[PDB]
Every structure is written in structure tokens, then in C-alpha cells.
Amino acid sequence: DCRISFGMNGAAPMIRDETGMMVPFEGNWIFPLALWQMNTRYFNQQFDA
Amino acid sequence: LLHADTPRLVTWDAGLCTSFKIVPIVPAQVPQDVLAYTFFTSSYAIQSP
Amino acid sequence: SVRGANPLMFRANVLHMLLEFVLDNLYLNRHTGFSQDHTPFTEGANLRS
Amino acid sequence: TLVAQISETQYPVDRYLDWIPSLRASAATAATFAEWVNTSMKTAFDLSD
DSSP: OOOOOOOOOOOOOOOOOSSSSEEEEEEEOOOOOOHHHHHHHHHHHHHHH | OOOOOOOOOEEOOOOOOOOOOOOOSSSSSSSSSSSSTTTSSGGTOOOOO | OOTTOGGGGHHHHHHHHHHHHHHHTOOEOOOOEEEESSSSSSSSOEEEE | OOOHHHHHHHOOOOOOEEEEOOOOOOOHHHHHHHHHHHHHHHHHHTTOO
């Protein structure tokens, strides 16, 4: 259940960590390949930049 | 009295059993000012239940 | 009036409506055939067709 | 010995290739796999029956 929410008014967007926390787009992550396979379109539009 | 129309009581169904359906009553606003269109999943042609 | 109904007969009309509802939903359920899930959305579940 | 590798079965098989991902094959998936194995062995030993 990785879920993205656009940060409005300048705040960075967040993503739903496994433990419930929301984290910005930086650092070191760990995916299963199934996530990217499930959302190949919506993910790269968000992450490639 | 001598021969009556026999009923047909064994009939089969193949689709999914249901009688209540969800219908849209007011269209959303997928282009708007506050939230970019890349947020919504309709922009990616994703099929939702 | 084509857009009017007598209020003193809503009960009779609703009883007939419920009877037709039940009479319509009197079918058996066919076994069609399934298919393994080749994508990672489910844990390899079997899906109808 | 081969079909015990890509499905759950009580046959003791020494279970080498596990780091390679795969799904628990159902009847139809295992049947297609067994068909490919069959036709391969027939082609190798020059059989037609």
C-alpha cells in the first residue's frame, strides 16, 4: 500500500512507508518488483524527475 | 384436466448475482486549478471498480 | 396526470414490486470456469470468466 | 521431479532453485508446463506416439 499525496503550496510529496509513516522523495528505499509492475505508469511520472 | 402446462422451474444464471448498481450522478472535475491532472488515476486510463 | 400517483395505494404497489423482485431473482448459479492470475496484483488467485 | 519444483507437493525433491522467483502453479499452469516437458522429450527421443 505505497500511496502518494501531492504536497501542496510548496511542501514536498509524501509516500506511505510500510510502518504507516509518510516520507518525502529522498534517501534509500526498498521495493519489491511487484509494486513497480503494478504501477509502472503512475510511478515513473512521479519518480523519474 | 387432461394435460396442464408444466412450469419451467430449473433455470440457470451465468453472470454475477446482484440487483444493486452504483451509478454516477454528477461528473467530477478532473482538470482543476488546485490539483494537477497527473494526480488522478483517470488520466492514466486505469480501470476502477 | 402522467406524473402523479395516488398516495393511498403505495402499499399495494410496493407489495407487487417486491413480489416481482423475488420472482425475477429465482435462478441457479452456473459454474463457468476460472483462470490463474499471471500478474502480481493478487497472490496467484483463480479468477472467473 | 520437475513439476514438484513449481508447485506445492509432498514429494521430497531436494529443492535447489528457490532464489529464482515463481508462483504456485495451479492445475492448468502445471499442465501446460508438463505438456512442454512431454513434447520436448518426444522431440529428443524421436517419437510420434
